[PDB]
């Protein structure tokens, strides 16, 4: 015979062979290799995700949900935004820059977890039909240790990334609030509920200027100081 | 008509997904993605990897030359699939 070295292995399965295309093969059948973790089988061939004991591991790709201090369910154009009341009526809008920054950060986090899978071709046997003794016990022990360590790693990673994602999504809102407060130097007062009381006549043009980052506070200062004090 | 009000806020969704953090074990967020795959197609895809199916034929039986293993001569593979119906129909043997 001829003895080579390569990427060949063996597997026990009772599943039919199809005409599809997939890079991960499992005794239960082929599985997609986009997610980093799997709960199908410990026997894999190809670029397969790591086996973990858990069945559900959710990663947060959004901000906290506060239904009816509260969220706006009708704002379908962005993540963070403004709602204003003035002499010409009431209105609402969304801020594109902050929304895009948060989306970009979340997408960058996701791109480092989805699609990065290692290739393992030939490994040890993980299912036994007879009882032998010391070597089989050692193999079982090694596999159990590996599975437990990887499950712990998966849980800790999910918790860490969720914590930092929620922190950044809150930080974006705090940044927008502080920027708006700094823009209105002495012509507006904080009310403590996320709202600013602006002590001068504001049209749609002035609110658009505030949302536009082109708001000159010097023109509206004498009237605001007269009304505030 | 001498004062305006400007409020800042975020967006909510009707339904929501519960996730876990280091500090909070139950926090509801707008959107979340699963990181564990728990489903299979039920068939072994054969396009990228060369797959050799052994029915009624174990690998050692194919190597030795079983009467039912005559179709596996001079064959290559990337994954040999052994079935649970595999049996031997030649002289009894015992690999130490």
């Amino acid at each position, epitope marked *: 015979f001829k003895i080579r070295s390569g990427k060949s292995s063996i597997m026990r399965s009772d599943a039919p062979i199809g005409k599809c295309k997939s890079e991960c093969i499992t005794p239960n059948g082929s599985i997609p290799n986009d997610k980093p973790f799997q709960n199908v089988n410990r026997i894999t061939y190809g670029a397969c995700p790591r086996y973990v004991k858990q069945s559900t591991l959710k990663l947060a790709t959004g901000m906290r949900n506060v239904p009816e201090e509260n969220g706006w369910e009708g704002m379908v154009d962005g993540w963070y935004g403004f709602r204003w009341q003035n002499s*010409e*009526g009431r*209105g609402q809008a969304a801020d594109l820059k902050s929304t895009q920054a948060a989306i970009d950060q979340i997408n960058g986090i996701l791109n480092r977890l989805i699609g990065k899978t290692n290739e393992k071709f030939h490994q040890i046997e993980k299912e036994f039909s007879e009882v032998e003794g010391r070597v089989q016990d050692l193999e079982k022990y090694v596999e159990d240790t590996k599975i437990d360590l990887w499950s712990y790693n998966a849980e800790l990673l999910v918790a860490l990334i969720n914590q930092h994602t929620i922190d950044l999504t809150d930080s974006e809102m705090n940044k927008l609030f502080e920027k708006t407060k700094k823009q209105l130097r002495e012509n507006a007062e904080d009310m403590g509920n996320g709202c600013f009381k602006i002590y001068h006549k504001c049209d749609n043009a002035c609110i658009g200027s505030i949302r536009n980052e082109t708001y000159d506070h010097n023109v509206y200062r004498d009237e605001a100081l007269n009304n505030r004090f | 008509n001498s004062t305006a009000t400007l409020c800042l806020g975020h967006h909510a969704v009707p339904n929501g997904t519960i996730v876990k953090t280091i500090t909070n074990d139950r926090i509801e967020v707008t959107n979340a993605t699963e990181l564990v795959q728990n489903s299979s197609i039920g068939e072994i895809c054969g396009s990228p990897h060369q797959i050799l199916d052994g029915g009624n034929c174990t690998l050692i039986d194919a190597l030795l030359g079983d009467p039912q293993c005559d179709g596996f001569q001079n064959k290559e593979w990337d994954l040999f699939v052994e079935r649970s119906r595999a049996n031997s129909n030649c002289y009894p043997y015992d690999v130490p």
Partner: antibody
Amino acid sequence: EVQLLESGPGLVKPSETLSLTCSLSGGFVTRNSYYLSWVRQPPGKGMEWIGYVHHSGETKYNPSLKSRVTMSMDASKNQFSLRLRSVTAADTAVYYCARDLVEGGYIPFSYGLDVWGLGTTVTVSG
Amino acid sequence: DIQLTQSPSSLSASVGDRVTITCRASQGIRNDLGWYQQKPGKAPERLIYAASSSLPGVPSRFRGSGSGTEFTLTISSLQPEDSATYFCLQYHNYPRTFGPGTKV
């Protein structure tokens, strides 16, 4: 998202009560900003508001339908139903169930009829 | 009740021209006006909610502008896909009066 689906009799004999139900998928009926409303359109005429119901046990109907209208809401099933008591030939119409969004805060802001449902035809005849 | 009236009806136009629909209210409202589109045999779809605020997915041809007791919906270009009924909604008060549709 939030979708609504309508179900009920397509034909009602005169001088009888007409009953319809609207079921909600993708959200909860017990939210403070949901005002579930019923609208109707006779063929060839304008569209008419019937009334709305809210999870706080508050209802509000159109004065034109003075007393022969009632609205109920079941939270355990995520449904809300409409009943019309006395029926004439002027009630032949396409009925829609819609969801209104009136949000609160320091600056209350309404959005109108956001989510609509596929209308059901109700024909009144003997 | 705040009655709503629509000035144009059964309007016919070319493919690539400009059209306008006007909604007037008997009583004074303040920016509370929505513009809806209804194709024959289908449910209405919301186009404008704050009367100067287009929703995601609405093509750029549609625009809305107005206040008080006068509101307008303007389309700069008319594609063959946009041939349906259009109506206006008021939500300042609860009776929720509509307006008779305008056919394009």
